[PDB]
Design a binder for these strands. Structure first.
Ligand SMILES: [Mg+2]
Ligand SMILES: [Mg+2]
Ligand SMILES: [Mg+2]
Ligand SMILES: [Mg+2]
Ligand SMILES: [Mg+2]
Ligand SMILES: [Mg+2]
Ligand SMILES: [Mg+2]
Ligand SMILES: [Mg+2]
Ligand SMILES: [Mg+2]
Ligand SMILES: [Mg+2]
Ligand SMILES: [Mg+2]
Ligand SMILES: [Mg+2]
Ligand SMILES: [Mg+2]
Ligand SMILES: [Mg+2]
Ligand SMILES: [Mg+2]
Ligand SMILES: [Mg+2]
Ligand SMILES: [Mg+2]
Ligand SMILES: [Mg+2]
Ligand SMILES: [Mg+2]
Ligand SMILES: [Mg+2]
Ligand SMILES: [Mg+2]
Ligand SMILES: [Mg+2]
Ligand SMILES: [Mg+2]
Ligand SMILES: [Mg+2]
Ligand SMILES: [Mg+2]
Ligand SMILES: [Mg+2]
Ligand SMILES: [Mg+2]
Ligand SMILES: [Mg+2]
Ligand SMILES: [Mg+2]
Ligand SMILES: [Mg+2]
Ligand SMILES: [Mg+2]
Ligand SMILES: [Mg+2]
Ligand SMILES: [Mg+2]
Ligand SMILES: [Mg+2]
Ligand SMILES: [Mg+2]
Ligand SMILES: [Mg+2]
Ligand SMILES: [Mg+2]
Ligand SMILES: [Mg+2]
Ligand SMILES: [Mg+2]
Ligand SMILES: [Mg+2]
Ligand SMILES: [Mg+2]
Ligand SMILES: [Mg+2]
Ligand SMILES: [Mg+2]
Ligand SMILES: [Mg+2]
Ligand SMILES: [Mg+2]
Ligand SMILES: [Mg+2]
Ligand SMILES: [Mg+2]
Ligand SMILES: [Mg+2]
Ligand SMILES: [Mg+2]
Ligand SMILES: [Mg+2]
Ligand SMILES: [Mg+2]
Ligand SMILES: [Mg+2]
Ligand SMILES: [Mg+2]
Ligand SMILES: [Mg+2]
Ligand SMILES: [Mg+2]
Ligand SMILES: [Mg+2]
Ligand SMILES: [Mg+2]
Ligand SMILES: [Mg+2]
Ligand SMILES: [Mg+2]
Ligand SMILES: [Mg+2]
Ligand SMILES: [Mg+2]
Lengths: 110, 117, 47
RNA sequence: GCGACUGUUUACCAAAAUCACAGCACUCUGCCAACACGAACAGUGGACGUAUAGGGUGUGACGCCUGCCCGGUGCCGGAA
RNA sequence: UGAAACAUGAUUGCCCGUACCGCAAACCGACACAGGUGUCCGAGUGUCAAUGCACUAAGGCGCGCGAGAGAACCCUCGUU
RNA sequence: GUAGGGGAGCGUUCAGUCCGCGGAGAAGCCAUACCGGAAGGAGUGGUGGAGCCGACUGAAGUGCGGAUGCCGGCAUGAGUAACGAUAAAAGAAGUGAGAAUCUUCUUCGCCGUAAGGACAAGGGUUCCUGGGGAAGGGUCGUCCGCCCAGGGAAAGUCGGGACCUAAGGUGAGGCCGAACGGCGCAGCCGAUGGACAGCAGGUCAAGAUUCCUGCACCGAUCAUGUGGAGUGAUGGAGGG
RNA sequence: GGUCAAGAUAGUAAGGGUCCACGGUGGAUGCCCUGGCGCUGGAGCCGAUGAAGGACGCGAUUACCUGCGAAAAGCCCCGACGAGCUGGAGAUACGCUUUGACUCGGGGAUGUCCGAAUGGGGAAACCCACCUCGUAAGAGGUAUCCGCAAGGAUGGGAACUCAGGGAACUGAAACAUCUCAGUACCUGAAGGAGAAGAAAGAGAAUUCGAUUCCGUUAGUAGCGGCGAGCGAACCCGGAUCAGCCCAAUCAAGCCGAAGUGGCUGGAAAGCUACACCUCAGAAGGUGAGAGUCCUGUAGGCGAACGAGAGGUCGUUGUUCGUGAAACGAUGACUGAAUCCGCGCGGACCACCGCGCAAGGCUAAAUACUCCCAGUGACCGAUAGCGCAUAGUACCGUGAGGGAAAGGUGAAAAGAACCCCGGGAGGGGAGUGAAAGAGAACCUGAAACCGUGGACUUACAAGCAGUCAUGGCACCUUAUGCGUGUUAUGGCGUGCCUAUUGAAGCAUGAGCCGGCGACUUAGACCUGACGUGCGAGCUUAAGUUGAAAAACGGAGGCGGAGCGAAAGCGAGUCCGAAUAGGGCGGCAUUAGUACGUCGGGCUAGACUCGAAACCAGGUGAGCUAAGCAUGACCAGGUUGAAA
């Protein structure tokens, strides 16, 4: 049963956007959006961190080796930022221009 | 709404199997033989309650008979001369006197015989 | 000794197949009453 | 002893005295034949046969033979 | 007034089936099963002959648990 | 105290409602010598990982040892019986992590109107190459008809169709019949048969009257010729 | 103290027993949902423009699924979305897209072969063609019936409806009329419904006024081996209304309020101190429970395209079984009047009433539910559909039968790397909160197999217990009424069912799990408890509202009995009155509606179990034979006719 299922497969944010971790261990940290997977509702922030072992696989690399790279995350501990405050920061949707739609807070915008 | 046994049966059963220990083979381990063994065990408990009431009485008796005879008295004659002088002792006690308390049994004897003749 | 089932391709097909099963009413009936039971195996034509 | 014979038979407890048989016998049948399958005036077998043919029934090579009872039943015929 | 027949040269050659097992471990027998499966070919020696029997050739195998024991008893066989 | 009628209640779920607990740990499970007259229910300790106890009330798929009951699991029999023809095996050599069993060698034993060879029906990649070894193999396996991957099959002349008809199956009109349908002439389908042009050799690990080499045959359309007036069916006969 | 003598008792365990600890096996239980199940409502046909349903194909790698059709996981146009996409599938490399992709709504184009198949054949998915145009590559056409043409029909559809055909088991404790029941099944046709329908009618009031539906009358009138059993309609209340004609707004989407600080924790949503929103506290996701994170909800907007006659004979129908048999209804014979006429009023007659046969269509309410949605004192892995999916695996020549299947974590962070081994498997490490989650990945019951330990066991006779005592051991409801174990004693015939009587050498059963059986319906019957109104008690169908219920007197029960009935009535009946049965008063007394329960009846009626019976179909690849066509019998002996 899908994860975006109950979230109208809807990504409230976007590839690029800065983010801050609400709930978890990484409570509050900054990250550009490197990967935003809407259906599974998963997404990568430059924060997270992880040590993965990529097993024997002789090609490439005879021996294994390891790797410090980072585990993706669930767009529900992802939070968009408010340039002023920069924290727990909901979103309103307004219109600048000229049929270009946008995004404020309680003090726009981002 | 449906209601599986879910739990109850395991409960009942364990109850029996916890009554059911020390029992030799299957008896102590399978329910049916266990509960069963216990039906009969029931019979034996009830009867043997009243029964032990008999058996002990027997035991006391033979000890007294002994006592009497240890001098020259019969049980029946001792106990009878201990009804005659009205010395209304329980016989359990009489056993006790008889086997743990020598010279006392001696006296009770001399008494019974006196009252007899 | 010798057995019930001695396969014969032409027999098999000319007996149980589809042109055959449709040639008769009760075979149309067999057909759709199979289809309903979601047979993958519709007919020995489909072997 | 039984069957005449070669044959047939109870797949998986009976192969024979069973059954078939050639032979004989009673009857039935004249053609869109009886007789048989049949929603059925269909169509089919009988048979592209024709009473030295066809059906049904029984006996069971061959050889000498096959008696007595027509009241009951059946069948053929009869008519007040 | 280009009808056949013919010689020669050109030219053309559709569709599926072809492996392998196929008297069996590969098919039918639930099995790598003492069964069942239709036709062909099936050498030599000895033998009255022969697809018969013994032994062989070409070819194909020794059948997918082994080793020892060497009682009762059981199966298949020899002698008396 | 049996069949039986009556009385009061214990537990299970779902439900309404309140008391309320729970990641400092719910249910479920495990141990035990506590409590209740009994169905039962509490204390604590170990398990577990996210839900649940209690009171009152309501509704039930509401309490199992049996039915040669149903599903499933695991015991007995037992390390027993059997390893599937009494055609029979030995030694050396090799390989491997490991070999009575797989691969070479040299013998021995069995079939030999077969237990050899070639087809058909059926099966379907079981064929060949290289690899694998869980399970299939009645043991073992390094091996296989099992597992993986890749390859292999070639036709004008063989066999079937592009021709024919038999039994049989069909079949416009036709004959019938509550319906679906049953018949049924010609015609058509139908090989087990009629018809019909190629043989000899060579070779892949794996094909072979196909492919390759050598020399043939048959039909078809065109062309140069011999042309130089007849061709010969949906009917006739012969023949088959 | 040594020797000898007599007498007594100890220890060992091959193995086993009881208890304990610790694993194994297995997958019960608890939790969970990715799957069901029912009710309400919505929606309801497809196809010669090729349907349902397939076969084969389309992929950089493609076996299954999915999507698609040689233009082949897609192609063109419009509209919504605005950042990601490249199907499940979890794999690399190739790429695509802010000139707007992907996904969504809406049309189009392309759609091989099979299948009504339909150019002819065929063993479905294959074989062989003929004709028209084309340079070929290609494209079209080539079934049959109604028709002048144009045009329509063929096939499929779970049920629902109508029609031709029409069983039996069963019950009557046997059976045959009869009942099962015009039920099962077969078939024909058709639709989104259908059927029925506009009076020669019900009928008894000189009333109603097409039909279908529900309530009711009503288990009443009646039918019947007058047995089992069968069972209306008029009236009364509702649902919805119709009567016409002919022959002389939803379907894509957008927009939407309001919290932070500290605390435990691996992780906040929980605890806490103060906050704000509400037309929004329905729900779901987020490391454990979030009104204020997310998706949403209340609300508001919302598209170019998009959707709204008589008679006779044999019979039969209604409650209609030859009964007084009316009427309709037809098979065979007969086939009248057309207005001062025709048909009915349950034989038949007059009277007096209701009616216009021989011609057609008709929405509406009603039935069903493959499918869509919403809910639930419905299920959560032996449940629930058969399926957490599969009509698949498997069995069957066929028709047909037909399974068990669930869980790592919050997230793959899926265990680089060292160790014994060919491996399998494990022991570290490292991740995590936990690896007491490590991929045979949630709990992990019991039977069942083992290791260790306590106490025991090799002169003993046994339903395996009990009860008494001694020994030994232990001390977390536990140092006393102890707990585990044991020796010796007394005592002692497994359980269930079936029975005059069971240890029975009488039935059942290997063991343990889990599933497993006295129920439901009716507004029926009769009772007990209770309740609310009480000489009074009460609604049903429906209507409206519906996070609730109220309306609804149509009918029902009580009110008066008695007879065969008319009828009479605190009386009545038999009879001519008497004498009596029934009844009222009585020397007195209440009903009714709901509900819970003990019984009853009709239906499967507590669950399991037949031998059998009937319908429709599937089988002669086995066996019994027939038909057409091929095939086959070494060798040897005997020596007929002519
Ligand atoms: Mg006494
Ligand atoms: Mg004979
Ligand atoms: Mg026999
Ligand atoms: Mg015999
Ligand atoms: Mg082949
Ligand atoms: Mg073998
Ligand atoms: Mg064999
Ligand atoms: Mg020869
Ligand atoms: Mg020879
Ligand atoms: Mg021989
Ligand atoms: Mg061989
Ligand atoms: Mg020895
Ligand atoms: Mg002798
Ligand atoms: Mg509750
Ligand atoms: Mg619970
Ligand atoms: Mg049981
Ligand atoms: Mg038995
Ligand atoms: Mg042994
Ligand atoms: Mg034995
Ligand atoms: Mg032995
Ligand atoms: Mg042996
Ligand atoms: Mg062998
Ligand atoms: Mg041997
Ligand atoms: Mg060598
Ligand atoms: Mg070596
Ligand atoms: Mg060998
Ligand atoms: Mg051979
Ligand atoms: Mg090989
Ligand atoms: Mg093995
Ligand atoms: Mg090797
Ligand atoms: Mg025919
Ligand atoms: Mg042929
Ligand atoms: Mg030829
Ligand atoms: Mg040929
Ligand atoms: Mg050639
Ligand atoms: Mg030992
Ligand atoms: Mg596919
Ligand atoms: Mg577009
Ligand atoms: Mg999107
Ligand atoms: Mg095209
Ligand atoms: Mg066709
Ligand atoms: Mg009967
Ligand atoms: Mg009866
Ligand atoms: Mg139809
Ligand atoms: Mg009549
Ligand atoms: Mg009648
Ligand atoms: Mg009439
Ligand atoms: Mg479970
Ligand atoms: Mg199930
Ligand atoms: Mg390892
Ligand atoms: Mg031990
Ligand atoms: Mg002794
Ligand atoms: Mg001893
Ligand atoms: Mg019982
Ligand atoms: Mg008896
Ligand atoms: Mg016994
Ligand atoms: Mg017994
Ligand atoms: Mg009996
Ligand atoms: Mg009452
Ligand atoms: Mg009542
Ligand atoms: Mg009952």
């Amino acid at each position: 049963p899908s994860a975006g299922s109950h979230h109208n497969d809807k990504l409230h944010f976007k590839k690029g956007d800065t983010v801050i971790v609400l709930s978890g261990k990484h409570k509050g940290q900054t990250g550009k959006v490197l990967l935003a997977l809407p259906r599974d509702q998963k997404v990568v922030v430059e924060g997270v961190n992880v040590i993965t072992k990529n097993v024997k696989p002789s090609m490439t690399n005879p021996q294994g080796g390891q790797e410090q790279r980072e585990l993706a995350l669930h767009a529900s501990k992802v939070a968009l930022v408010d340039p002023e405050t920069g924290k727990a920061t909901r979103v309103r949707k307004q219109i600048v221009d000229g049929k270009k739609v946008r995004v404020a807070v309680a003090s726009g915008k981002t | 709404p449906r209601a599986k046994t879910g739990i109850v049966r395991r409960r009942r059963h364990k109850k029996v199997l916890k009554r059911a220990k020390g029992f030799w083979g299957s008896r102590s381990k399978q329910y049916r033989n266990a509960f069963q063994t216990l039906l009969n065990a029931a019979t034996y408990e009830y009867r043997d309650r009243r029964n032990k009431k008999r058996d002990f009485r027997r035991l006391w008796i033979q000890r007294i008979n002994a006592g009497a005879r240890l001098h020259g008295m019969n049980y029946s004659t001792f106990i009878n001369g201990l009804k005659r002088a009205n010395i209304d002792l329980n016989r359990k006690v009489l056993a006790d006197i008889a086997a743990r308390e020598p010279e006392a049994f001696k006296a009770l004897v001399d008494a019974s015989r006196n009252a007899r003749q | 000794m010798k057995r019930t089932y001695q396969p014969n391709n032409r027999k098999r097909a000319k007996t149980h197949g589809f042109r055959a099963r449709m040639k008769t009413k009760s075979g149309r009936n067999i057909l759709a009453r199979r289809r309903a039971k979601g047979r993958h195996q519709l007919t020995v034509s489909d072997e």
